[PDB]
Design a binder for this molecule. Structure first.
Ligand SMILES: [Fe+2]
Ligand SMILES: [Fe+2]
Ligand SMILES: [Fe+3]
Ligand SMILES: [Fe+3]
Ligand SMILES: [Fe+3]
Ligand SMILES: [Fe+3]
Ligand SMILES: [Fe+3]
Ligand SMILES: [Fe+3]
Ligand SMILES: [Fe+3]
Ligand SMILES: [Fe+3]
Ligand SMILES: [Fe+3]
Ligand SMILES: [Fe+3]
Ligand SMILES: [Fe+3]
Ligand SMILES: [Fe+3]
Lengths: 170, 170, 170, 170, 170, 170
């Protein structure tokens, strides 16, 4: 019945990992949409384009790391459609950053619930895996985006947004 | 209003590039599934894992190139769900290559359709874009996969698949 | 006789190549004028100066590539007066970018026209020459100018124009 | 029935590729004959020897490119005898250049008709392969040889031919 | 009324600078026409091609120097059409050199009269700018071209012209 | 007259050199065919591909050395059609090696024949030329192909052929 490697890895944890993989892929797709939106001729903010392209890349990397963890523990990857983002268009650099903060907080709460599932089944290894690989970077990300929101509000619309975008690129 | 850059770019073409983007994303997700299946403990062919990870990355890059093209011509990117692959498990290395060939032929026919759409609207720049970025690569990939199928049948299962896999990795 | 090299090169294509040479020379002269205007003591925007100087050079380079193409195909270069630009003065940096976009779109239409002539006469080589040498760089330029216009509107007049110009220079 | 890679590749195009491969071989052979003739003791023009040696190699390379193309699209190479050249001796340097121009014009017309065959069957990839790999080179070569005829008539026989030949070697 | 930098800069001198800019452009265009003519398949003198290409660039550079001068003194650039050359074809290498000598002599007389205009208005800085930037180069070029006419008559037609041309390229 | 360089070079030797040139060209074309066949999608043996491509080149190189020898001795090169190969398809790698051995032994007999002609006419220089340039490399090649046949029989069909081909490539 069990896969060869499998040890102290609960079915509830396995299912949860699969759900987290879909969420991280979803987040990647939201950031992809935002990145390409920022390169529209009528938006044209190359720093935001670049910032969200990297964020898309990172989210996909997170998903791929969970995929490999699943396999390593002897679980089985089950993929689901990657739902399209809620929006086609993402407003101002400030609007988009706020949107990113909300997305990262959603991702974080899912990871925190994932850790809770690990605790529940006394999976000490999975707890550590989640702390080291995701929780630490989530808190860093969330602070980073928050600082960006405060600055985007500080600089204002127009020239301020342009100058913040040039600093992103730099 | 029309977008500021837009010139000689038909709505038919715009819509068809959006469908092509989805399709390339779908192909990327198929290859991602295959790549991760090949690293299961009970499959464990790292060359196939590598080969399909690279193919997933290439398909995604094709999607992104189309996304930028859309923007450059002044059309608007419209994203749809990326549907999950047909299967969760992909058989032998031979089986998976056969599956890859059928996927790439489906992708090629879509690109040739895309070209015809550009032809239909006398979009000389788009024809060139598709010829140079996609059509040449696709013929090469199709031939490559075909060569791999012949060899996977030549070597047979067991040690043959194993040795073929090692040569993939190297 | 026909010239020694002449093969599958229609008189209609030959005349049209000559018309396009004149137009690319015209475009070069417009951008020369712009470039110089931006160095007036009462305008003094060195980045705009540099940007339109590069534009003038590229247009002249296009004209020269067409001259050489004419000769290569066994056609005969026929030069016409290079008409003075539409203006002596070119307004703000935003104004000048909008003027450039209009120019580049008129040039692109002329190039697409030229490709049409090549199609009509079943001149495969000429089509390819136009596609690879002019059509791709035209769509890039039109997107680039469009992005600039968005950003010049974004930053506004005064300090914004100043800061935009510095970044052109960088 | 079909080869595994075969897609959008017409029988007519396949047969015509095979005819073109024979023609490129035949041109290689003509140039080989000319090259060797120019190293006869009673001819002794090493520049002409080297020039036609290079041309022979290029033609063979063209044929071999078409051979790999055939295979890549899933067509089947079919080789025919390579007929001997119409002459055993090729006259003056000027005579040989005129003879080369005619050959290259015959080859170019064949490539133009091959492009038309691809057009007829809506084979966009084949069209691009011919344009990029053969048609551009052919117009270049036809111009080059025409310039050489002009200069060989300019310099005249005897010392002129000797000097022209040294410049070829240089 | 006056531009901010304007000091000791007469209206007459300003208008005359604008006339000189047109003349330098017109000379550039003549040399461009000659350069391209020499790369016709039925002319085919690459040394002459290169030589007149260089001369075309220098003349354009002269014009652009006068444009920046105008601006620097606080005058206003006024551009006129650049008339097409009096010929479409320029004969032998010797014919073209004779034609270049006449052109350069016409240009030099114009520069000498421009210097007189500066003299007339006691513009010491303008005098020095013309002497150092234009008059010295012109006497050098007039000597150079005269030496070339002498040698082109020396070597004679046919092989002589061919050898002269190679030496130009060298 | 006899040609200027001609000394101790019999008509019989001259004709035979021409026959050998044709045969070496024939052998080159056979190995070209083989080389290309091994790149078919349904054959796909890149090592065999590479090995017969080198063989084709070496045979052509032999042919060219004989052409130059003909000329050097004051003989006159007479070219004949290069007959198409015996097959269009060349079976397994073992099959193709056995076909090559037969070819090489037929070529060697022709070369030994040629040396005999040189002996008959007491042409010491020609004998040496044949010995040092062809006979030694023929005996090496025939041993090399024989070793390959033994090993292709040793390894068997399927995986063995595959592994042999990889080592050809290495
Ligand atoms: Fe192309
Ligand atoms: Fe010896
Ligand atoms: Fe994440
Ligand atoms: Fe995250
Ligand atoms: Fe793709
Ligand atoms: Fe693809
Ligand atoms: Fe242009
Ligand atoms: Fe342009
Ligand atoms: Fe060729
Ligand atoms: Fe060719
Ligand atoms: Fe000048
Ligand atoms: Fe001057
Ligand atoms: Fe041989
Ligand atoms: Fe041999």
């Amino acid at each position: 019945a069990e896969t060869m490697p499998r040890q102290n890895f609960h079915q509830d944890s396995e299912a949860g990992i699969n759900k987290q993989i879909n969420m991280e892929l979803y987040a990647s797709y939201v950031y992809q949409s935002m990145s390409f939106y920022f390169d529209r001729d009528d938006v044209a903010l190359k720093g935001f384009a670049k910032f969200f392209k990297e964020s898309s890349d990172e989210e996909r990397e997170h998903a791929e790391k969970l995929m490999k963890y699943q396999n390593k523990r002897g679980g089985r990857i089950v993929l689901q459609p990657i739902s399209k983002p809620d929006r086609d268009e993402w407003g101002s650099g400030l609007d988009a950053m706020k949107a990113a903060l909300n997305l990262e907080k959603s991702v974080n709460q899912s990871l925190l619930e994932l850790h809770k599932v690990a605790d529940s089944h006394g999976d000490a290894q999975m707890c550590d895996f989640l702390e080291g690989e995701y929780l630490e970077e989530q808190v860093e990300a969330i602070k980073d985006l928050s600082d960006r929101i405060t600055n985007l509000n500080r600089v204002g619309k127009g020239l301020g947004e342009w100058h913040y975008d040039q600093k992103l690129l730099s």
